[PDB]
Design a protein around this ligand. Structure first.
Ligand code: B12
Ligand code: GDP
Ligand code: 5AD
Ligand code: MG
Ligand code: MG
Lengths: 1067, 158, 233
C-alpha cells in the first residue's frame, strides 16, 4: 500500500558537502514507504544532480546542504531544471539550522517545493516529512512521454528518458512498441551484458570499462548504460545503487538509466527488451546492461545481449563449484575482479580450465581463454585494460566501427597490481590486539592474587611470632611467591612507598614541580591524589591497571603533570579569506603566551578546488571556513605567528588535499625563517645558509595535520582521490618526515569525532578510531618503518557527548594503546603514550533554545579536562545555526577559562581516579571496544570491512536509532522534544551570522589569477613532474614541497586526478 | 574524632583476622596443619565489635542486592521494588549505585563505616536508598497585599 | 538552619559549614535544656547551604551528613530518622557578576552539577541576570537542572562521587577543618558566647575582605571581570 504511481527520487548532498548523515536517513524512509531512490551520495554539483534526475526521469529531488551557499545552489538547480525540460520535477532540501527561515521563504518562493527546518522535523516527525514529500511527487509521468519516435531517434536524450518511463510502466501504445523494435532491429548496435555475483564489482568494472572507451576513442562513442538492482517487494520501492559508483558517465555522449527488478526473483526488469530496443533506436554506438546480484545458476541476461561478461571474485569456495555455475557456459568473457584478494592467482587457473572444458577447446591453451583478472578499484589497472582490449576486438568483429586506440595495447589476461596495504598474513591483526589486552588483564589478576597471598603470609608470620608460637612453614610459602611474582611486578610494589613520599610533599623533585594549590579556605588540594590501600593486592592491581599520570599504562594521562602555562585550549577557526581568519586567530590567541591555533577550511578548499565564478562553487567560497588556494594565501593566514616557535602549534583540519595543504604550511614555516634571517642580517642567506635554515625548520616546526583517510571513507567523506592513492601519499608524508627528522609534527590525526557526529555511539567511535589507528601501524610496518619511528607521530581526535561512556573514553584509549604498543609491537615509552584532542559534540547542540547549548558544552568540556585530555575545543551556543560569531566564540572560550581557573575540583589533576563508577565504566567500555575489534577482524580487518561497508552501515544504523528516539521522546532533549518554550520560537529575533563578504570572494579570485600569472611559465612543467612522480612511483609529497610554489590547490588536485583517480563513493 | 579512631582500629582487626584465616587455608593446602593461626584468628573475632562484625557479615548479601536489575525490599506485608539499571544508547548498563570491588576486608569495613551506600549509616552518600523519581520544586509567590499573593498561588498551582 | 547568608556575606566553605552545623547543634542543646526528647525535634530540622566554585563545596553536603549522623547517634543517642541530615543547596549568587552575564550560566551549571552528584535533597538554580527575574531568565536557570537530571550521562548514576581518591581525601580534610572550628567556638563560650564577642561576624568580615582583595589583586582569576575582560566594555 505505497504510492499510487511508480515514484522515483534522486538524492544527494550538495557540492563540496560531506554531510550525508541527514540525507541517508531520508532515502531510507523514502525506500521504506515504497519509492525507487537513485542515490548519488555526497559531493554533487548541480550539473550532476540535474543530469541524473533528467535521465532517470524522476518526480522529486532531495538535496542536503550543510556547507552553506545553498541559496545560490538551489536557485541554480531550479533554473537548470526549467531550462532543460524538468520544470515538473519537484525539489526538496534541508540543512538543519544552516538554512535560516528567511532563506527558506526565499527559496520556496523561487521554485523549491519545500525546505525542512529542524523545527519542521519536530512537528512533522521523520516519517511525516517523507510522507509529505512523497505525496507531493505522487504523479503519473507517462503524460510527458512521446507518442512518436521522431524525437528519440533524432537524438533527444530527454525524450528517450521519458519514453523509457512509458515503456517500463507499460503505458506505451502497442503500435509504437512494435515500431520501436522494428527500427531497433535495423539499428544493428551491439549490446554488452554484464552479470555476476552480488558485490563482485559489476558497477565498478562497468565504469572503468567506459573510461577506457572514452580515453581510447576521444569520447567519440555514444554509450547507453542500463543498470538493474534488486527491488524489495516488501516495501514497494528499491535502492538503485549502481549510479553512485559511476564516475566516468558524466558526459553528453553517455546516458544511464537505473531500473528496479520489480520482482523478488528475476535479475532483469520485465521490460528490459523494450528498454534496450529504445536505446538501440536512439542511435547509441553501444548499449551496456548490468544485472543485479544473481545466483550461481542464473543466466537470464544471455538471450537479451549480443555479448555477455561474467564478473566474479576469487572467493568461490571449492574448484568443483565452477561446474555448477551456469554462466560459465554462456559467457563470452569472464572477469575475475578484486584480483588483489588472496587466492586470485589460483582462482584464475580454475576458471580458465573450467571455461576451456565448457568450450571443448582442448587444442587451445588454458591461458588463452577469455578469462581476465581485473582490479576495478585500482586506477588505470592493466588488468582492466587487457579485458577492454579483448572486448574491443570482439565488438569490432560484431560490426562496430572504431578508430585505432590510443591506449597501451598490452598482452596477458591477468592484472599485475602488486600493491598491498596490509598483508593477508596480518589479516587478523585487530583480533591479535584484543588478545594482547585481555592477556594483560589476566596477568594483573594473577599477579595480584600472588602479591596478596604473599603479604597475608608474612603478615600472619609476624603475628605468630608476636604471640610466641612460631612456624617457619609460613615463610616457605611466602618465599615461594616471591619467585612467582614477575620481575616488573615485584619492583612496582617495591617502589610504592618511595612513590608515596614523592607525591606527599609540597613539591616534586626530579627539576621541581609544585604539588599543592591552596584554597580560600586554606585547604591543600594535591595535584595528584594517591590511593590509601593497605592490601598489596589492591596496590599492584591499581599500579598495573591505572598508574599515576605519566606512568604505564598511562591510563590517567601520558604526562606527569599538566602544562604550567600552555592550557590544552585549541579553538577551531576559519571564515572568509586568509586576512579575516588571521584576525580571528589573533582574537582567540589573545592574552595567551602559548599560541595554539586550529584552522577550518571552506568546502571548496576541503575538496582541493580553486575558487571559481560558477554558482555551484562561488557561493561556497570563504563560507564555513577560510578559503586557501595558493601558498600566498597560506602565508597571509599565519602572518605574525612564528611557526617555528616552541610555544606555537597550528592544527589544520584537512583530509583529501591534506598533502598539498601540508606542503603549503611547511613552505610557509620555512619562508618565515628565511625572512627572519634576511632581516637580522640585511641580506639573503647563501645556498649553504638557507640549506641549514630549511633543514632546521622541518625539525622544530610544531603542529598537526588530520589527513586520516580511513575515516574519510567511513565518516567525513572528504576523500577526493582514490582511497588507495590517498593512503599511498599519506605514507609518503611519514617517510618524508622520518628522513628529515620532522619529530614535532603529527603526520595524521587518527580521528573519530567525525564518525561520531555522523551518528556513531561512543563505543563505535572509540573502537573504529583505534582500529583505524592500528591499521596505519600495520600498514607502515609492512612498509618497512621501525615502530618507534612513526608511532610518536600519531595524534588522535575524539568527540565528547552526553553519553556516560564519553567520561572514560580518553582513559580507555590511552590504556588500549599503551598495553598493545608495549606487549604486541614492543615499542618504546614515547610510542606507548597516546595523545589526543577532544572536541565537544556539535550534534548534541540544537537550533531550538540556543542558550541551552552552553550548558551541554560545559558538561562535555568538564569530563574532557577531568580525564586529562591534551587538547580541547569548545563549541559556540549558536552551533546549529552558524560558524562562531565574535561574541559567540568568547562564551565558548570562557567555558574552558572558567573550568581551568575558577573551578575547584579542577585544581586536582586526577579526580576521576578511585571512582567506583569510573573504574567500572572504564573496564566495560574497554571490553566493548575489544569485542568490536574482533567483529572487524572477522570481516577482513578495517580495509576488509570497508569493502563491505560495515562501518558506514553500522554508523548509519546507530544514527537512525538515535534520531528515531530524538523525535520520539524516549530520549529526552531539553528544549526540543520536552520543555518547549511557551512562545514556540527558536531564536525568535535575528541572530548574527558568519558568512563571507562579496569583496572577499572577488579578492580570492583576483589573487588567484594574479598568482597564476606569476608562475605561468613553470606551471605546466611542475604539474608534469608531479604526474611523473606518481607514474614512476616515487614520493609524491616530496614533489609537492616544490609544486605548491608555482601551482594552485586546484591545479595540483586536477593534475593528480589524471594519475591518481577519483574517489568511488560507498553509499 | 573518636568515631574515626574506631574505624582505624576495627579495620586493622578485620584485616588481620582475614590474613590469618587466609594463611590457615593456604597451609592446609600444602599439608602443614598449624592451628596456632586459628587461635589468633578467633582472638580477633571477639576483638571486633558487635556492629562491625555484622557489617562484614552482610557484605556479600549486600553485593547480591545491588547486582541484579532490581532491588527487592519488603516493607510491612508487601514489597517495594526499585530498578537498578538504566541502559545507554550503546547498550551499556549503568547501575544506580556502584559498589566497591575490594578483596581486603579491612578496606570493606573501613568503607562501610566511613562511606556506606546511600541510605545507610553514616549516610555519607545520601540519606535515602535511591533518588525520588519525578519534583519538590515549590511554587514561590509574595508581592503586594494578601489578595494579589493569593491569586498568584491559585494561578500557579492550578 | 541556614548558612546561605553566611556564605553570601563572604565566608569560605569551611566557615559556612562549620558555623551552620554549630548553629544547628546550638538549637539542639537549647531544646534539650527545655527537658525535651531528641527524637521529637531532630528529624524535622532542615538545612540550607550554598554551592560555589571552591573545591570544598564538592564535598560540603556529604561532610554535613556524616558529622550529623555520627554525633546524633553516638553523642545524643537519637534514632535513625534523626541521624539523617536533609538539606537544600542553592548556587552561589555572589559568584554571579554583572560583567559578561552570559558567563554566569556556566558557573551555575558547574555548581548545580556537584550538588546533584553529592545527592542533595533540594536544589535552586540562579539566573544569568541585576534586573528583575524575567520569565526567560528563570527558564535558563530551570533548564540547567533539567539538562543535568534528564540528559547528562554520569547523572544516571546516583553515587558517582564515591570511590574518588580526591573526594574521599577532601571529605576527610573538610570534616577535620570543621571540627577544629567547633573547638574554636567552644573556647569562646559556644555559639552564643562567640556571638557576644562578634567572633562569627568578625571572621566572615575578614574572609569577605580577603576574597574581595585577591579578586582586585588579580590573584584570584574571575573570567570576564579581572581577566579576559570585554574588549569594548
Ligand atoms: C554532524 C555534523 C558534521 C559531521 C558530518 C557527518 C556526516 N557524515 O554527515 C562532520 C563532523 C564530519 C562534519 C564536518 C564538517 N562540518 Co559539520 N556539522 C554537523 C552538525 C553537528 C549536525 C548536522 C547533522 O548531521 N544533523 C543531523 C540532522 C539529521 O538533523 P538536523 O540537521 O537538525 O535536520 C533536520 C531537518 O532540517 C531535516 N532535514 C535536514 N536535512 C534534510 C534533507 C532532506 C532531504 C529532508 C527531507 C529533510 C532534511 O531533517 C532533520 C529532522 O530532525 C552541524 C551543526 C548542527 N548541530 O546543526 C555541523 C555543521 C553543519 N557543520 C559545519 C561545518 C562548517 C563543517 C566543516 C566544513 C568544518 C570544516 N571546515 O572542516 C566539516 C567538513 C564537512 C565535509 N566533509 O564536507 C557548520 C556549517 C557552517 C555553515 N554552513 O554556516 C555546522 C552548522 C557547525 C557550525 N556551527 O560550525 N559536520
Ligand atoms: N578489493 C577490491 N574491491 C573492489 C574492486 N572493485 C570494486 N571493488 C569494491 O567492491 C564494492 C562493490 O562494488 P560494486 O561496483 O558496487 O559491485 P556490484 O554491486 O556487483 O556492482 C565497492 O566497495 C567497490 O569499491 C577490486 O578490484 N578490489
Ligand atoms: C564539525 C564540527 O566542527 C566545528 N566547526 C566547523 N566549522 C567551524 C568553524 N569555522 N569554527 C568553529 N568550529 C567549527 C563545529 O563544532 C561542528 O560541529
Ligand atoms: Mg552494482
Ligand atoms: Mg547491480
Amino acid at each position: 500500500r505505497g504510492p499510487a504511481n511508480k515514484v522515483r527520487f534522486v538524492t544527494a548532498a550538495s557540492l563540496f558537502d560531506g554531510h550525508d548523515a541527514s540525507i541517508n536517513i531520508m532515502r531510507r524512509i523514502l525506500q521504506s514507504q515504497g519509492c525507487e531512490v537513485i542515490h548519488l551520495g555526497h559531493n554533487r554539483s548541480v550539473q550532476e544532480v540535474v543530469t541524473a534526475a533528467l535521465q532517470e526521469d524522476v518526480q522529486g529531488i532531495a538535496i542536503s546542504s550543510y556547507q552553506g551557499g545553498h541559496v545560490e545552489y538551489f536557485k541554480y538547480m531550479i533554473d537548470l531544471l526549467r531550462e532543460h525540460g524538468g520544470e515538473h520535477i519537484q525539489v526538496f532540501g534541508g540543512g538543519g539550522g544552516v538554512i535560516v527561515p528567511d532563506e527558506i521563504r526565499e527559496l520556496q518562493a523561487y521554485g523549491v517545493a519545500r525546505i525542512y527546518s529542524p523545527e519542521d522535523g519536530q512537528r512533522m516527525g521523520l516519517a511525516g516529512m517523507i510522507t509529505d514529500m512523497a505525496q507531493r511527487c505522487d504523479i503519473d509521468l507517462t503524460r510527458y512521454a512521446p507518442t512518436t519516435l521522431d524525437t528519440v531517434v533524432a537524438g533527444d536524450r530527454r525524450a528517450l528518458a521519458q519514453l523509457i518511463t512509458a515503456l517500463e510502466n507499460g503505458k506505451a501504445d502497442p503500435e509504437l512498441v512494435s515500431a520501436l523494435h522494428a527500427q531497433a532491429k535495423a539499428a544493428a548496435v551491439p549490446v554488452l551484458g554484464i552479470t555476476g555475483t552480488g558485490g563482485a564489482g559489476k558497477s565498478s568494472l562497468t565504469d572503468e570499462l567506459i573510461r577506457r572507451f572514452r580515453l581510447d576513442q576521444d569520447d567519440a562513442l555514444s554509450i547507453a548504460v542500463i543498470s538493474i538492482d534488486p527491488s524489495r517487494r516488501k516495501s514497494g520501492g528499491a535502492l538503485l545503487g549502481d549510479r553512485i559508483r559511476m564516475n566516468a558517465i558524466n558526459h553528453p555522449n553517455i546516458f544511464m538509466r537505473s531500473l528496479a527488478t520489480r520482482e523478488a526473483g528475476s535479475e532483469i526488469s520485465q521490460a528490459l527488451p523494450d528498454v534496450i530496443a529504445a536505446c538501440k533506436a536512439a542511435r547509441f554506438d553501444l548499449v551496456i546492461v548490468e544485472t543485479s546480484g544473481i545466483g550461481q545458476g542464473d543466466a537470464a541476461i544471455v538471450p537479451h545481449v549480443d555479448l555477455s561478461l561474467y564478473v566474479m571474485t576469487p572467493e568461490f569456495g571449492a574448484a568443483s563449484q565452477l561446474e555448477k555455475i551456469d554462466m560459465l557456459d554462456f559467457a563470452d568473457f569472464v572477469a575475475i575482479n578484486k584480483f588483489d584478494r588472496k587466492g586470485a592467482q589460483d582462482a584464475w587457473r580454475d576458471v580458465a580450465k573450467q571455461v576451456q572444458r565448457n568450450r571443448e577447446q582442448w587444442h587451445s591453451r588454458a591461458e588463452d581463454m577469455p578469462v581476465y583478472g581485473t582490479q576495478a578499484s585500482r586506477f588505470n589497472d592493466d588488468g582492466v585494460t587487457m579485458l577492454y582490449q579483448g572486448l574491443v576486438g570482439a565488438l569490432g568483429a560484431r560490426g562496430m566501427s572504431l578508430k585505432p586506440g590510443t591506449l597501451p595495447n598490452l598482452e596477458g589476461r591477468i592484472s599485475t597490481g602488486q600493491n598491498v596495504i596490509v598483508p593477508p598474513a596480518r589479516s587478523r591483526y585487530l583480533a591479535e590486539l584484543a588478545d594482547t589486552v585481555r592477556a594483560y588483564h589476566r596477568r594483573v589478576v594473577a599477579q595480584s592474587k600472588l602479591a596478596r597471598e604473599r603479604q597475608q603470609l608474612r603478615a600472619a608470620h609476624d603475628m605468630l611470632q608476636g604471640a610466641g608460637h612460631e612456624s617457619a612453614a609460613l615463610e616457605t610459602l611466602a618465599s615461594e611467591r616471591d619467585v612467582s611474582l614477575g620481575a616488573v611486578e615485584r619492583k612496582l610494589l617495591a617502589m610504592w612507598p618511595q612513590m608515596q613520599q614523592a607525591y606527599s610533599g609540597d613539591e616534586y623533585v626530579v627539576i621541581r614541580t609544585g604539588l599543592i594549590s591552596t584554597t580560600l579556605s586554606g585547604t591543600k588540594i594535591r595535584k595528584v591524589v594517591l590511593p590509601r590501600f593497605e592490601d598489596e593486592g589492591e596496590i599492584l592491581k591499581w599500579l598495573m591497571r591505572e598508574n599515576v599520570p605519566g606512568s604505564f599504562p598511562y591510563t590517567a594521562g601520558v604526562f606527569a603533570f599538566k602544562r604550567e602555562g600552555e592550557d590544552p585550549t585549541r579553538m577551531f577557526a576559519g571564515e572568509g579569506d586568509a586576512f579575516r581568519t588571521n584576525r580571528r586567530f589573533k582574537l582567540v590567541s589573545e592574552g595567551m603566551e602559548a599560541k595554539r591555533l586550529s584552522t577550518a577550511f571552506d568546502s571548496v578548499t576541503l575538496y582541493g578546488e580553486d575558487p571559481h565564478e560558477r554558482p555551484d562553487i562561488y557561493g561556497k567560497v570563504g563560507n564555513s571556513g577560510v578559503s586557501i588556494a595558493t601558498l600566498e594565501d597560506m602565508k597571509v593566514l599565519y602572518d605574525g605567528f612564528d611557526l617555528t616557535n616552541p610555544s606555537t602549534s597550528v592544527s589544520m583540519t584537512i583530509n583529501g588535499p591534506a598533502p598539498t595543504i601540508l606542503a603549503m604550511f611547511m613552505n610557509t614555516a620555512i619562508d618565515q625563517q628565511i625572512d627572519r634571517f634576511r632581516a637580522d642580517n640585511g641580506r639573503d642567506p647563501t645556498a649553504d645558509e638557507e640549506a641549514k635554515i630549511r633543514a632546521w625548520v622541518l625539525q622544530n616546526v610544531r603542529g598537526t595535520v588530520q589527513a586520516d583517510i580511513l575515516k574519510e571513507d567511513q565518516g567525513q567523506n572528504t576523500c577526493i582521490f582514490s582511497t588507495e592513492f590517498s593512503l599511498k601519499v599519506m605514507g609518503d608524508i611519514q617517510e618524508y618526515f622520518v628522513h628529515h627528522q620532522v619529530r614535532n609534527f603529527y603526520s595524521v590525526s587518527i580521528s573519530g569525532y567525525h564518525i561520531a557526529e555522523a551518528g556513531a555511539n561512543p563505543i563505535s567511535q572509540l573502537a573504529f578510531t583505534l582500529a583505524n589507528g592500528f591499521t596505519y601501524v600495520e600498514a607502515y610496518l609492512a612498509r618497512g618503518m621501525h615502530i618507534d619511528d612513526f608511532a610518536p607521530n600519531l595524534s588522535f581526535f575524539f568527540s565528547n557527548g552526553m553519553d556516560p561512556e564519553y567520561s572514560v573514553l580518553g582513559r580507555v584509549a590511552r590504556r588500549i594503546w599503551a598495553v598493545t604498543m608495549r606487549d604486541k609491537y614492543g615499542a618504546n615509552d614515547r610510542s606507548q603514550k597516546l595523545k589526543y584532542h577532544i572536541q565537544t559534540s556539535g550534534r548534541s547542540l540544537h537550533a531550538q533554545e540556543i542558550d541551552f547549548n552552553d550548558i551541554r558544552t560545559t558538561l562535555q568540556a568538564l569530563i574532557a579536562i577531568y580525564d586529562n585530555c591534551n587538547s580541547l575545543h569548545t563549541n559556540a551556543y549558536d552551533e546549529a545555526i552558524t560558524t562562531p560569531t565574535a561574541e559567540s566564540v568568547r562564551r565558548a572560550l570562557a567555558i574552558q577559562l572558567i573550568i581551568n581557573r575558577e573551578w575547584g575540583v579542577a585544581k586536582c589533576e586526577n579526580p576521576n581516579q578511585g571512582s567506583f563508577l569510573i573504574e567500572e565504566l572504564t573496564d566495560l567500555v574497554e571490553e566493548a571496544v575489544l569485542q568490536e575489534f574482533e567483529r572487524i577482524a572477522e570481516r577482513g580487518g578495517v580495509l576488509g570491512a570497508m569493502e563491505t561497508g560495515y562501518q558506514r552501515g553500522k554508523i548509519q544504523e546507530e544514527s537512525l536509532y538515535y534520531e528515531q528516539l530524538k523525535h520520539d521522546g524516549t530520549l529526552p532533549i531539553i528544549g526540543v522534544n520536552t520543555f518547549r518554550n511557551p512562545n514556540g520560537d527558536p531564536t525568535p529575533q535575528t541572530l548574527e551570522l558568519a558568512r563571507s563578504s562579496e569583496d572577499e570572494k572577488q579578492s580570492q579570485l583576483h589573487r588567484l589569477t594574479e598568482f597564476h600569472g606569476a608562475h605561468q611559465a613553470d606551471a605546466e612543467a611542475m604539474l608534469a613532474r608531479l604526474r611523473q612522480a606518481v607514474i614512476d612511483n616515487r614520493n609524491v609529497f616530496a614533489v609537492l614541497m616544490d609544486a605548491v610554489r608555482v601551482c594552485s590547490l586546484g591545479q595540483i588536485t586536477h593534475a593528480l586526478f589524471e594519475v591518481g583517480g577519483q574517489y568511488r563513493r560507498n553509499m | 574524632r573518636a568515631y574515626h579512631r574506631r574505624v582505624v582500629a576495627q579495620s586493622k582487626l578485620a584485616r588481620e583476622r582475614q590474613q590469618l584465616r587466609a594463611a590457615h587455608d593456604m597451609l592446609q593446602g600444602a599439608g602443614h596443619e598449624s592451628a596456632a593461626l586459628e587461635t589468633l584468628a578467633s582472638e580477633r573475632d571477639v576483638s571486633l565489635g558487635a556492629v562491625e562484625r555484622k557489617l562484614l557479615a552482610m557484605w556479600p548479601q549486600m553485593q547480591q542486592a545491588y547486582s541484579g536489575d532490581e532491588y527487592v525490599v519488603k516493607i510491612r506485608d508487601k514489597e517495594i521494588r526499585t530498578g537498578l539499571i538504566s541502559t545507554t544508547l550503546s547498550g551499556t548498563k549503568i547501575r544506580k549505585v556502584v559498589l566497591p570491588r575490594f578483596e581486603d576486608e579491612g578496606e570493606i569495613l573501613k568503607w562501610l563505616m566511613r562511606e556506606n551506600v546511600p541510605g545507610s549509616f553514616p549516610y555519607t552518600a545520601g540519606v535515602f536508598a535511591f533518588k525520588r523519581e519525578g519534583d519538590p520544586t515549590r511554587m514561590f509567590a509574595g508581592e503586594g497585599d494578601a489578595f494579589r499573593t493569593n491569586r498568584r498561588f491559585k494561578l500557579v498551582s492550578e
